[PDB]
Design an enzyme around this catalytic site. Structure first.
Site, PDB file in Angstrom:
ATOM      1  N   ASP A 107      -0.463  -5.052   3.366  1.00 56.42           N
ATOM      2  CA  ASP A 107       0.736  -4.532   3.996  1.00 56.42           C
ATOM      3  C   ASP A 107       0.839  -3.023   4.031  1.00 56.42           C
ATOM      4  O   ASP A 107       0.791  -2.389   2.997  1.00 56.42           O
ATOM      5  CB  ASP A 107       2.052  -5.183   3.365  1.00 56.42           C
ATOM      6  N   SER A 133       9.261  -5.064  -2.903  1.00 53.41           N
ATOM      7  CA  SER A 133       9.900  -4.688  -4.181  1.00 53.41           C
ATOM      8  C   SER A 133      10.123  -5.931  -5.072  1.00 53.41           C
ATOM      9  O   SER A 133      10.915  -5.913  -6.000  1.00 53.41           O
ATOM     10  CB  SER A 133      11.243  -3.930  -3.990  1.00 53.41           C
ATOM     11  N   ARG A 174      -4.153  -4.168 -12.908  1.00 53.44           N
ATOM     12  CA  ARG A 174      -2.894  -4.869 -12.516  1.00 53.44           C
ATOM     13  C   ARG A 174      -3.148  -5.513 -11.146  1.00 53.44           C
ATOM     14  O   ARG A 174      -2.543  -6.485 -10.795  1.00 53.44           O
ATOM     15  CB  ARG A 174      -1.653  -3.946 -12.444  1.00 53.44           C
ATOM     16  N   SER A 234      11.876  -6.583   9.929  1.00 49.17           N
ATOM     17  CA  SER A 234      11.936  -6.159   8.532  1.00 49.17           C
ATOM     18  C   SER A 234      13.320  -5.617   8.278  1.00 49.17           C
ATOM     19  O   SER A 234      13.809  -4.804   9.037  1.00 49.17           O
ATOM     20  CB  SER A 234      10.921  -5.013   8.305  1.00 49.17           C
ATOM     21  N   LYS A 243       3.820  -1.506  10.801  1.00 51.15           N
ATOM     22  CA  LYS A 243       5.259  -1.577  11.133  1.00 51.15           C
ATOM     23  C   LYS A 243       5.678  -0.468  12.060  1.00 51.15           C
ATOM     24  O   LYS A 243       5.310   0.677  11.866  1.00 51.15           O
ATOM     25  CB  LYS A 243       6.103  -1.521   9.868  1.00 51.15           C
ATOM     26  N   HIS A 279      10.336  -2.055  11.532  1.00 53.22           N
ATOM     27  CA  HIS A 279      10.456  -1.728  10.131  1.00 53.22           C
ATOM     28  C   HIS A 279      11.890  -1.821   9.670  1.00 53.22           C
ATOM     29  O   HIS A 279      12.109  -2.342   8.605  1.00 53.22           O
ATOM     30  CB  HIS A 279       9.942  -0.333   9.856  1.00 53.22           C
ATOM     31  N   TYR A 296       3.737   4.888   6.147  1.00 53.28           N
ATOM     32  CA  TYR A 296       3.077   5.215   4.876  1.00 53.28           C
ATOM     33  C   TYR A 296       1.934   6.254   5.114  1.00 53.28           C
ATOM     34  O   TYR A 296       1.344   6.742   4.167  1.00 53.28           O
ATOM     35  CB  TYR A 296       2.545   3.965   4.150  1.00 53.28           C
ATOM     36  N   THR A 306      -3.621   0.270  -9.661  1.00 52.46           N
ATOM     37  CA  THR A 306      -4.279   0.159 -10.988  1.00 52.46           C
ATOM     38  C   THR A 306      -5.256  -1.006 -11.007  1.00 52.46           C
ATOM     39  O   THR A 306      -4.881  -2.155 -10.964  1.00 52.46           O
ATOM     40  CB  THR A 306      -3.228  -0.042 -12.103  1.00 52.46           C
ATOM     41  N   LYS A 331      -6.166  -7.016 -10.402  1.00 52.83           N
ATOM     42  CA  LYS A 331      -6.809  -8.273 -10.837  1.00 52.83           C
ATOM     43  C   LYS A 331      -5.709  -9.230 -11.442  1.00 52.83           C
ATOM     44  O   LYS A 331      -5.671 -10.463 -11.203  1.00 52.83           O
ATOM     45  CB  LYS A 331      -8.011  -7.960 -11.783  1.00 52.83           C
ATOM     46  N   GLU A 332      -4.742  -8.636 -12.131  1.00 58.82           N
ATOM     47  CA  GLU A 332      -3.678  -9.425 -12.794  1.00 58.82           C
ATOM     48  C   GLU A 332      -2.788 -10.094 -11.755  1.00 58.82           C
ATOM     49  O   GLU A 332      -2.580 -11.319 -11.772  1.00 58.82           O
ATOM     50  CB  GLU A 332      -2.813  -8.546 -13.700  1.00 58.82           C
ATOM     51  N   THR A 390       0.867  -1.250   0.000  1.00 59.13           N
ATOM     52  CA  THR A 390       0.000   0.000   0.000  1.00 59.13           C
ATOM     53  C   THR A 390       0.856   1.234   0.000  1.00 59.13           C
ATOM     54  O   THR A 390       0.350   2.333   0.113  1.00 59.13           O
ATOM     55  CB  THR A 390      -0.907   0.110   1.205  1.00 59.13           C
TER      56      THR A 390
HETATM   57  N1  LIG Z   1       9.587  -3.317   4.803  1.00 59.09           N
HETATM   58  C1  LIG Z   1       9.836  -2.228   4.064  1.00 59.09           C
HETATM   59  O1  LIG Z   1      10.809  -1.294   4.420  1.00 59.09           O
HETATM   60  C2  LIG Z   1       9.141  -1.955   2.784  1.00 59.09           C
HETATM   61  C3  LIG Z   1       9.816  -1.255   1.791  1.00 59.09           C
HETATM   62  C4  LIG Z   1       9.301  -1.190   0.494  1.00 59.09           C
HETATM   63  C5  LIG Z   1       8.041  -1.750   0.280  1.00 59.09           C
HETATM   64  N2  LIG Z   1       7.372  -2.412   1.277  1.00 59.09           N
HETATM   65  C6  LIG Z   1       6.069  -3.003   1.016  1.00 59.09           C
HETATM   66  O2  LIG Z   1       6.071  -3.770  -0.159  1.00 59.09           O
HETATM   67  C7  LIG Z   1       5.075  -3.330  -1.086  1.00 59.09           C
HETATM   68  C8  LIG Z   1       5.411  -3.472  -2.565  1.00 59.09           C
HETATM   69  O3  LIG Z   1       6.740  -3.057  -2.850  1.00 59.09           O
HETATM   70  P1  LIG Z   1       7.080  -1.669  -3.590  1.00 59.09           P
HETATM   71  O4  LIG Z   1       6.391  -0.513  -3.071  1.00 59.09           O
HETATM   72  O5  LIG Z   1       8.622  -1.721  -3.608  1.00 59.09           O
HETATM   73  O6  LIG Z   1       6.550  -1.854  -5.102  1.00 59.09           O
HETATM   74  P2  LIG Z   1       6.402  -3.185  -5.990  1.00 59.09           P
HETATM   75  O7  LIG Z   1       5.329  -4.174  -5.556  1.00 59.09           O
HETATM   76  O8  LIG Z   1       7.740  -3.828  -6.192  1.00 59.09           O
HETATM   77  O9  LIG Z   1       5.934  -2.513  -7.370  1.00 59.09           O
HETATM   78  C9  LIG Z   1       5.358  -1.221  -7.455  1.00 59.09           C
HETATM   79  C10 LIG Z   1       5.323  -0.717  -8.902  1.00 59.09           C
HETATM   80  O10 LIG Z   1       5.014  -1.750  -9.812  1.00 59.09           O
HETATM   81  C11 LIG Z   1       3.887  -1.427 -10.578  1.00 59.09           C
HETATM   82  N3  LIG Z   1       3.030  -2.612 -10.866  1.00 59.09           N
HETATM   83  C12 LIG Z   1       2.169  -3.260  -9.975  1.00 59.09           C
HETATM   84  N4  LIG Z   1       1.607  -4.298 -10.644  1.00 59.09           N
HETATM   85  C13 LIG Z   1       1.977  -4.256 -11.933  1.00 59.09           C
HETATM   86  C14 LIG Z   1       1.712  -5.088 -12.995  1.00 59.09           C
HETATM   87  N5  LIG Z   1       1.075  -6.241 -12.789  1.00 59.09           N
HETATM   88  N6  LIG Z   1       2.412  -4.839 -14.203  1.00 59.09           N
HETATM   89  C15 LIG Z   1       3.316  -3.784 -14.369  1.00 59.09           C
HETATM   90  N7  LIG Z   1       3.582  -2.963 -13.289  1.00 59.09           N
HETATM   91  C16 LIG Z   1       2.919  -3.215 -12.097  1.00 59.09           C
HETATM   92  C17 LIG Z   1       3.062  -0.439  -9.710  1.00 59.09           C
HETATM   93  O11 LIG Z   1       2.394   0.390 -10.548  1.00 59.09           O
HETATM   94  P3  LIG Z   1       0.889   0.996 -10.195  1.00 59.09           P
HETATM   95  O12 LIG Z   1       0.628   1.042  -8.754  1.00 59.09           O
HETATM   96  O13 LIG Z   1       0.860   2.353 -10.804  1.00 59.09           O
HETATM   97  O14 LIG Z   1      -0.058  -0.056 -10.763  1.00 59.09           O
HETATM   98  C18 LIG Z   1       4.196   0.321  -9.024  1.00 59.09           C
HETATM   99  O15 LIG Z   1       4.717   1.431  -9.735  1.00 59.09           O
HETATM  100  C19 LIG Z   1       4.803  -1.873  -0.698  1.00 59.09           C
HETATM  101  O16 LIG Z   1       3.526  -1.455  -1.083  1.00 59.09           O
HETATM  102  C20 LIG Z   1       5.015  -1.880   0.802  1.00 59.09           C
HETATM  103  O17 LIG Z   1       3.845  -2.384   1.298  1.00 59.09           O
HETATM  104  C21 LIG Z   1       7.909  -2.527   2.534  1.00 59.09           C
HETATM  105  C1  LIG Z   2      14.456   6.505   0.417  1.00 59.98           C
HETATM  106  C2  LIG Z   2      13.312   7.312   1.049  1.00 59.98           C
HETATM  107  C3  LIG Z   2      13.239   7.007   2.543  1.00 59.98           C
HETATM  108  C4  LIG Z   2      12.922   5.512   2.716  1.00 59.98           C
HETATM  109  C5  LIG Z   2      11.599   5.127   2.028  1.00 59.98           C
HETATM  110  C6  LIG Z   2      11.712   5.443   0.532  1.00 59.98           C
HETATM  111  C7  LIG Z   2      10.476   5.085  -0.296  1.00 59.98           C
HETATM  112  C8  LIG Z   2       9.298   4.360   0.519  1.00 59.98           C
HETATM  113  C9  LIG Z   2       9.779   3.466   1.634  1.00 59.98           C
HETATM  114  C10 LIG Z   2       8.944   2.469   2.012  1.00 59.98           C
HETATM  115  C11 LIG Z   2       9.310   1.539   3.103  1.00 59.98           C
HETATM  116  O1  LIG Z   2       8.506   0.658   3.430  1.00 59.98           O
HETATM  117  C12 LIG Z   2      10.678   1.705   3.778  1.00 59.98           C
HETATM  118  C13 LIG Z   2      11.190   3.162   3.691  1.00 59.98           C
HETATM  119  C14 LIG Z   2      11.167   3.670   2.242  1.00 59.98           C
HETATM  120  C15 LIG Z   2      12.115   2.809   1.397  1.00 59.98           C
HETATM  121  C16 LIG Z   2      11.988   6.937   0.413  1.00 59.98           C
HETATM  122  C17 LIG Z   2      12.011   7.550  -0.988  1.00 59.98           C
HETATM  123  C18 LIG Z   2      13.109   8.619  -0.928  1.00 59.98           C
HETATM  124  C19 LIG Z   2      13.411   8.760   0.593  1.00 59.98           C
HETATM  125  O2  LIG Z   2      14.717   9.282   0.814  1.00 59.98           O
END
Ligand SMILES: NC(=O)c1ccc[n+]([C@@H]2O[C@H](COP(=O)([O-])OP(=O)(O)OC[C@H]3O[C@@H](n4cnc5c(N)ncnc54)[C@H](OP(=O)(O)O)[C@@H]3O)[C@@H](O)[C@H]2O)c1
Ligand SMILES: C[C@]12CC[C@H]3[C@@H](CCC4=CC(=O)CC[C@@]43C)[C@@H]1CC[C@@H]2O
Length: 322
Positions: free
Chosen positions: A49, A216, A275, A165, A83, A116, A54, A272, A277-278, A22
């Site tokens: 999540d 990611s 994406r 995390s 978190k 986190h 956030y 989206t 549903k996908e 999210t």
């Molecule tokens: N523990 C942590 O520190 C931490 C850090 C980073 C992330 N997270 C969690 O992990 C989640 C996901 O990771 P993330 O934010 O790094 O992003 P991600 O899931 O790796 O991907 C996000 C990007 O991919 C695009 N996308 C989604 N589905 C798609 C599809 N089927 N085809 C093509 N592109 C697609 C999204 O576009 P659109 O949204 O525009 O569709 C968005 O720009 C986050 O939401 C957060 O909950 C946790």
């Molecule tokens: C790296 C950053 C601080 C850390 C952020 C990052 C993007 C979103 C984010 C999501 C998480 O779940 C962990 C912290 C992070 C990874 C931010 C974008 C630029 C900013 O400096």
């Protein structure tokens, strides 16, 4: 319906193996998370999540509470994660943070509350406080003491499950190895994708019974600018493309289904509808072992999140091989 499948947590709770992510870039209104979470739930997502970080917890909670009031789901069908941000590592800040998040969510508990990052920062009103420049202000808090405060969150019935995390092995061991440990971290949620497949961490987590939850997994949002500038782009990898073509899938779907076949719980963020549903069709096909071994070859140990703000911290996780 295989899309509701869960993996066993060491504490007897169950977590859906695919989770709705999210986080969006600050410029994106938190209402999109709200609209997107409703749609994700309709699609069958159950594991949601989020994180204090956030600042979308009131929005996600409305969504979830919307999906409950109209019969779609029951509270116990939903698996919500939040978190502990690093400005609240201090034990006495841990419960009030989580209750804060519940009050915002208007829910009675979160199903998973996790630390986190292992790096504590200075408490107060800034989310990442920084000095007359750039650099975050580190605070020195023992991770085990943060841990105990979390165990107490579980015992209070505030969080059904607790975990961490962005820990490396050394830092998991520290918690594992805590004299007097009541609860083990049920998961280590870390960046994971074909460019940083995490094969040593993953083996370690498994041998310890810890679930690795990947974020990611679709290649991140690629912020800010400098990373988007030179980080390879996951979904366009010509070999992930070949694989999507062969299985009549999409790149995203290959990358999601790679994680699941390694017993990873994998997160996937899309606001989206299409994406969303996908992504949940990840459960509609499998990859043969020979395809997993070709995806294995993409590993390069590249990180979309180096969390640069904690460089020079005592507990910065990413220095060790794993
Ligand atoms: N523990 C942590 O520190 C931490 C850090 C980073 C992330 N997270 C969690 O992990 C989640 C996901 O990771 P993330 O934010 O790094 O992003 P991600 O899931 O790796 O991907 C996000 C990007 O991919 C695009 N996308 C989604 N589905 C798609 C599809 N089927 N085809 C093509 N592109 C697609 C999204 O576009 P659109 O949204 O525009 O569709 C968005 O720009 C986050 O939401 C957060 O909950 C946790
Ligand atoms: C790296 C950053 C601080 C850390 C952020 C990052 C993007 C979103 C984010 C999501 C998480 O779940 C962990 C912290 C992070 C990874 C931010 C974008 C630029 C900013 O400096």
């Amino acid at each position: 319906d295989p899309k509701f499948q869960r993996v066993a947590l060491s504490d007897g709770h169950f977590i859906p193996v695919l989770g709705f992510g999210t986080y969006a870039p600050e410029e994106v209104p938190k209402s999109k998370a709200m609209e997107a979470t409703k749609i994700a739930i309709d699609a069958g997502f159950r594991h949601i999540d989020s994180a204090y970080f956030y600042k979308n917890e009131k929005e996600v909670g409305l969504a979830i509470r919307s999906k409950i009031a109209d019969g779609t789901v029951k509270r116990e069908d939903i698996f919500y994660t939040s978190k502990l941000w690093c400005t609240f590592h201090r034990p006495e800040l841990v419960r009030p943070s989580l209750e804060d998040s519940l009050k915002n969510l208007q829910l009675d508990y979160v199903d998973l509350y996790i630390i986190h990052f292992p790096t504590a920062l200075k408490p107060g009103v800034e989310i990442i406080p920084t000095d007359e420049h750039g650099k975050a202000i580190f605070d020195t808090v023992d991770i085990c003491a943060t841990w105990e405060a979390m165990e107490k969150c579980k015992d209070a019935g505030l969080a059904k499950s607790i975990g961490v995390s962005n820990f490396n092995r050394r830092q998991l061991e520290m918690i594992l190895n805590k004299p007097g440990l009541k609860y083990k971290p049920v998961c280590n949620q870390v960046e994971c994708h074909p460019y940083l497949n995490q094969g040593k961490l993953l083996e370690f987590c498994k041998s310890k019974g810890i679930v690795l939850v990947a974020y990611s997994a679709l290649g991140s949002h690629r912020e800010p600018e400098w990373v988007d500038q030179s980080a390879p782009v996951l979904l366009e990898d010509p070999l992930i493309g070949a694989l999507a073509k062969k299985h009549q899938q999409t790149p995203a779907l290959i990358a999601l289904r790679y994680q699941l076949q390694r017993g990873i719980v994998v997160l996937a963020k899309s606001f989206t509808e299409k994406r969303i549903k996908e992504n949940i069709q990840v459960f509609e096909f499998q990859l043969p072992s020979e395809d997993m071994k070709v995806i294995d070859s993409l590993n390069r140990n590249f990180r979309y999140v180096t969390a640069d703000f904690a460089i020079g911290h005592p507990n910065y996780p990413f220095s060790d091989e794993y």
